[PDB]
From Swiss-Prot:
Maturation and modification: Autophosphorylated.
Species name: Lactococcus lactis subsp. lactis (strain IL1403) (Streptococcus lactis)
Taxonomic lineage: Bacteria, Bacillati, Bacillota, Bacilli, Lactobacillales
Inducing factors: By maltose, trehalose and sucrose and repressed by glucose and lactose.
Activity-pH dependence: Optimum pH is around 7. Relatively stable in solution within the pH range of 5-9.5.
Catalytic activity line of the entry: beta-D-glucose 1-phosphate = beta-D-glucose 6-phosphate
Sequence similarity: Belongs to the HAD-like hydrolase superfamily. CbbY/CbbZ/Gph/YieH family.
NCBIfam families according to UniProt: bPGM (TIGR01990), HAD-SF-IA-v3 (TIGR01509), PGMB-YQAB-SF (TIGR02009)
Name assigned to this protein: Beta-phosphoglucomutase
Pfam families: Hydrolase (PF00702)
Entry GO CC: cytoplasm
Domain of life: Bacteria
Length: 221
């Protein structure tokens, strides 16, 4: 039986994408860059803050100093943080709260493996802090996804090997990161946005303890 579940945040526990979009668009418009639209924003899904800014500057062809780069990222984050102040428990994705309750009741470890440095605050906004045994720190791994580092850290943060864990993800890079850690991925969304050779559910209402247990047994030899 698996000993831990390693949760991505954005697209699994909640959606942060519209907030990130408005913030990046505002930043792009502030510096006079065209191209940051809803189509482009899909490329930034699951991507780190710094890698996201770099992609926007390549709309381009914009060069900036290392300190200018840091200031731009700080500006966008400051705006993003103002906007997520009204995140609430109503923003928890379907099925996720009951899954967390059931994992906790069965003494299965719960860890966050999100790229977001705003993860702890978001979990607090959603009243989920108490469920999480640990939060892997993005600022102390990287290697961003698809590197397995954040999932390895999340597993180790709760005293388990990735091989003893399930990872939940909504992105290609995240699914690959789970695989390369040794944990078992279960993706949410469309297969073309996730990857191959994995169990996939169309939405998070399918993430039940019963289903995770069944999938676990299916993937043991
Ligand atoms: O800027 P942060 O709050 O540290 O978030 C970092 C990243 O977290 C997630 O992975 C989102 O999907 C990204 O769109 C976001 O850029
Ligand atoms: F929160 Be995950 F990095 F989409
Ligand atoms: Mg995600
Ligand atoms: Na609301």
């Amino acid at each position: 039986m698996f000993k831990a579940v390693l949760f991505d945040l954005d697209g699994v526990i909640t959606d942060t994408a519209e907030y990130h979009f408005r913030a990046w668009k505002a930043l792009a418009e502030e510096i006079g860059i065209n191209g940051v639209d809803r189509q482009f924003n899909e490329q930034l899904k699951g991507v780190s803050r710094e890698d996201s800014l770099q992609k926007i500057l390549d709309l381009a062809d914009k060069k900036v100093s290392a300190e200018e780069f840091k200031e731009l990222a700080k500006r966008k984050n400051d705006n993003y943080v103002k906007m997520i102040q009204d995140v609430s428990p109503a923003d928890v994705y379907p099925g996720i709260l009951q899954l967390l309750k059931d994992l906790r009741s069965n003494k299965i470890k719960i860890a966050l493996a999100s790229a977001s440095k705003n993860g702890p605050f978001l979990l607090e906004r959603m009243n989920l802090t108490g469920y999480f045994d640990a939060i892997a720190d993005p600022a102390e791994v990287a290697a961003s996804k698809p590197a397995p580092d954040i999932f390895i850290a999340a597993a180790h943060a709760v005293g388990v090997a990735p091989s003893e864990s399930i990872g939940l993800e909504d992105s290609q890079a995240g699914i690959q990161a789970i695989k390369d850690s040794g944990a078992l991925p279960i993706g949410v969304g469309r297969p073309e946005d996730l990857g191959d050779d994995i169990v996939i559910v169309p939405d998070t209402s399918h993430y039940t303890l019963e289903f995770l247990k069944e999938v676990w047994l299916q993937k043991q030899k």
